[PDB]
Write a protein that holds these residues in place. Structure first.
Motif, PDB file in Angstrom:
ATOM      1  N   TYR A  43       2.904   2.173  -1.089  1.00 38.76           N
ATOM      2  CA  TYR A  43       4.137   2.148  -1.873  1.00 38.76           C
ATOM      3  C   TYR A  43       4.253   0.882  -2.714  1.00 38.76           C
ATOM      4  CZ  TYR A  43       9.035   2.644  -3.141  1.00 38.76           C
ATOM      5  OH  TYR A  43      10.213   2.750  -3.842  1.00 38.76           O
ATOM      6  N   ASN A  44       3.802  -0.238  -2.156  1.00 37.28           N
ATOM      7  CA  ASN A  44       3.948  -1.540  -2.793  1.00 37.28           C
ATOM      8  C   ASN A  44       2.647  -2.027  -3.409  1.00 37.28           C
ATOM      9  OD1 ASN A  44       6.794  -2.175  -1.806  1.00 37.28           O
ATOM     10  ND2 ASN A  44       5.722  -1.793   0.130  1.00 37.28           N
ATOM     11  N   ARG A  45       2.769  -2.789  -4.494  1.00 36.26           N
ATOM     12  CA  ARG A  45       1.611  -3.373  -5.161  1.00 36.26           C
ATOM     13  C   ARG A  45       1.105  -4.561  -4.341  1.00 36.26           C
ATOM     14  NH1 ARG A  45       3.311   0.425  -6.923  1.00 36.26           N
ATOM     15  NH2 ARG A  45       1.756   1.035  -5.349  1.00 36.26           N
ATOM     16  N   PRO A  46      -0.192  -4.904  -4.478  1.00 45.06           N
ATOM     17  CA  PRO A  46      -0.786  -5.995  -3.695  1.00 45.06           C
ATOM     18  C   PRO A  46      -0.055  -7.341  -3.762  1.00 45.06           C
ATOM     19  CG  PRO A  46      -2.510  -4.744  -4.756  1.00 45.06           C
ATOM     20  CD  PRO A  46      -1.212  -4.193  -5.275  1.00 45.06           C
ATOM     21  N   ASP A  47       0.575  -7.646  -4.897  1.00 40.99           N
ATOM     22  CA  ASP A  47       1.214  -8.953  -5.093  1.00 40.99           C
ATOM     23  C   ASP A  47       2.623  -9.089  -4.486  1.00 40.99           C
ATOM     24  OD1 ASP A  47       2.384  -7.243  -7.026  1.00 40.99           O
ATOM     25  OD2 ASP A  47       2.801  -8.926  -8.370  1.00 40.99           O
ATOM     26  N   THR A  48       3.052  -8.116  -3.681  1.00 45.01           N
ATOM     27  CA  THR A  48       4.398  -8.121  -3.102  1.00 45.01           C
ATOM     28  C   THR A  48       4.408  -8.629  -1.662  1.00 45.01           C
ATOM     29  OG1 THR A  48       4.207  -5.827  -2.328  1.00 45.01           O
ATOM     30  CG2 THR A  48       5.119  -6.175  -4.537  1.00 45.01           C
ATOM     31  N   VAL A  49       5.571  -9.096  -1.214  1.00 39.38           N
ATOM     32  CA  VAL A  49       5.720  -9.592   0.157  1.00 39.38           C
ATOM     33  C   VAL A  49       5.462  -8.486   1.183  1.00 39.38           C
ATOM     34  CG1 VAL A  49       7.340 -11.421  -0.478  1.00 39.38           C
ATOM     35  CG2 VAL A  49       8.214  -9.169   0.192  1.00 39.38           C
ATOM     36  N   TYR A  50       5.849  -7.258   0.846  1.00 37.58           N
ATOM     37  CA  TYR A  50       5.743  -6.125   1.773  1.00 37.58           C
ATOM     38  C   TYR A  50       4.290  -5.727   2.014  1.00 37.58           C
ATOM     39  CZ  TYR A  50      10.475  -5.959  -0.062  1.00 37.58           C
ATOM     40  OH  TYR A  50      11.740  -6.297  -0.482  1.00 37.58           O
ATOM     41  N   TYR A  51       3.514  -5.648   0.934  1.00 35.48           N
ATOM     42  CA  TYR A  51       2.086  -5.355   1.027  1.00 35.48           C
ATOM     43  C   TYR A  51       1.368  -6.435   1.831  1.00 35.48           C
ATOM     44  CZ  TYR A  51      -2.741  -4.356  -0.463  1.00 35.48           C
ATOM     45  OH  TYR A  51      -4.087  -4.071  -0.490  1.00 35.48           O
ATOM     46  N   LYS A  52       1.614  -7.693   1.474  1.00 31.60           N
ATOM     47  CA  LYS A  52       0.937  -8.820   2.111  1.00 31.60           C
ATOM     48  C   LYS A  52       1.219  -8.877   3.612  1.00 31.60           C
ATOM     49  CE  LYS A  52       0.867 -11.603  -2.117  1.00 31.60           C
ATOM     50  NZ  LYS A  52       1.408 -12.804  -2.819  1.00 31.60           N
ATOM     51  N   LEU A  53       2.477  -8.685   3.997  1.00 28.94           N
ATOM     52  CA  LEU A  53       2.843  -8.695   5.411  1.00 28.94           C
ATOM     53  C   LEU A  53       2.249  -7.489   6.134  1.00 28.94           C
ATOM     54  CD1 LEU A  53       4.364 -10.077   7.725  1.00 28.94           C
ATOM     55  CD2 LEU A  53       6.360  -8.694   7.127  1.00 28.94           C
ATOM     56  N   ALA A  54       2.302  -6.322   5.499  1.00 31.47           N
ATOM     57  CA  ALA A  54       1.727  -5.105   6.084  1.00 31.47           C
ATOM     58  C   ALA A  54       0.248  -5.299   6.412  1.00 31.47           C
ATOM     59  CB  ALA A  54       1.913  -3.920   5.147  1.00 31.47           C
ATOM     60  N   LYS A  55      -0.507  -5.854   5.466  1.00 32.30           N
ATOM     61  CA  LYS A  55      -1.942  -6.085   5.665  1.00 32.30           C
ATOM     62  C   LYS A  55      -2.189  -7.116   6.765  1.00 32.30           C
ATOM     63  CE  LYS A  55      -6.187  -7.469   3.288  1.00 32.30           C
ATOM     64  NZ  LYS A  55      -6.753  -8.003   2.017  1.00 32.30           N
TER      65      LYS A  55
END
Ligand SMILES: COc1ccc(-c2cn(C)c(=O)c3cc(C(=O)NC4CCS(=O)(=O)CC4)sc23)cc1OC
Length: 101
Positions: free
Chosen positions: A78-90
């Motif tokens: 759902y989120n692009r790589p440069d977002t807080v949500y993507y980064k935390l998810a990974k």
């Protein structure tokens, strides 16, 4: 409380410590992100995972881990790589699976 329920409660407590802001504490609402429900077909979050443990819906640790991965995968689609949500998810996906061993 069964042995599996006790283990999953322990894993869940430790996983949620990695999300101090609670980005994954509850379902992502369409109020928060309009159109989320129309993109992500199988939403998941820590709160729903807690309810599933309490309902004794996880019959194996593998099933629990699959829901955790689903939650993280959803955030990374759902989120692009440069977002807080993507980064935390990974971050928590890898750290979480390591922790559970
Ligand atoms: C108000 O509390 C929250 C604020 C944000 C979120 C949230 C969580 N997770 C896991 C997400 O994936 C997420 C994505 C969100 C969002 O606004 N996305 C847009 C901005 C980033 S984008 O352009 O890559 C995709 C569209 S808000 C949100 C969840 C919340 O409550 C649990």
């Amino acid at each position: 409380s069964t042995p599996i329920q006790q283990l999953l409660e322990h894993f869940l407590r430790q996983l949620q410590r990695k999300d101090p802001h609670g980005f994954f504490a509850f379902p992502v609402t369409d109020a928060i992100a309009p159109g989320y429900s129309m993109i992500i077909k199988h939403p998941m979050d820590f709160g729903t995972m807690k309810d599933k443990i309490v309902a004794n819906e996880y019959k194996s640790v593998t099933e629990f881990k699959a829901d955790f991965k689903l939650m993280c995968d959803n955030a990374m689609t759902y989120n692009r790589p440069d977002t807080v949500y993507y980064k935390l998810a990974k971050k928590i996906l890898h750290a979480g699976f390591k922790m559970m061993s």
